[PDB]
């Protein structure tokens, strides 16, 4: 768990720099929020 709780959005599932891959997987999982109408932009 990276953060304060074990949820699916922040579950990097880190394999045994680190900021790069963690941000990469967060970004890859965040795009699906656009389907869930979780945006107030464009």
């Amino acid at each position: 768990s990276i953060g304060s709780s074990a949820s699916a959005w922040t579950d990097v599932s880190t394999q045994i720099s680190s900021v790069s891959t963690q941000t990469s997987t967060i970004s890859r999982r965040l795009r699906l929020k656009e389907m869930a109408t979780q945006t107030e932009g464009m």
């Binding site: 709780s5 074990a6 949820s7 699916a8 959005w9 929020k33 869930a36 109408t37 979780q38």
Partner: protein, 76 residues
């Protein structure tokens, strides 16, 4: 080549809370509801159809129909 009521009611004591709130934040649709459950191709043809047919005869359906009828009648 029944008991499900009791089992469903008993299973409802161990779910987490933060993940529950997270899922409640993300809306669902007609695709995500059945995309996680295995299906048989013969019966998957009529799966949304049957649930919608049974849902149009639900208590909420009667409530919403009565509210609409009362609202329209109120225009007299």
């Amino acid at each position: 080549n029944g008991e499900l009521r009791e089992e469903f009611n008993a299973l409802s004591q161990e779910i987490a809370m933060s993940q529950l709130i997270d899922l409640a934040l993300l809306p669902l649709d007609m695709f995500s509801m059945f995309s996680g459950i295995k299906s048989t191709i013969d019966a998957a043809k009529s799966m949304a159809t049957n649930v919608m047919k049974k849902f149009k005869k639900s208590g909420l359906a009667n409530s919403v129909s009565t509210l609409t009828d009362s609202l329209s009648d109120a225009a007299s």
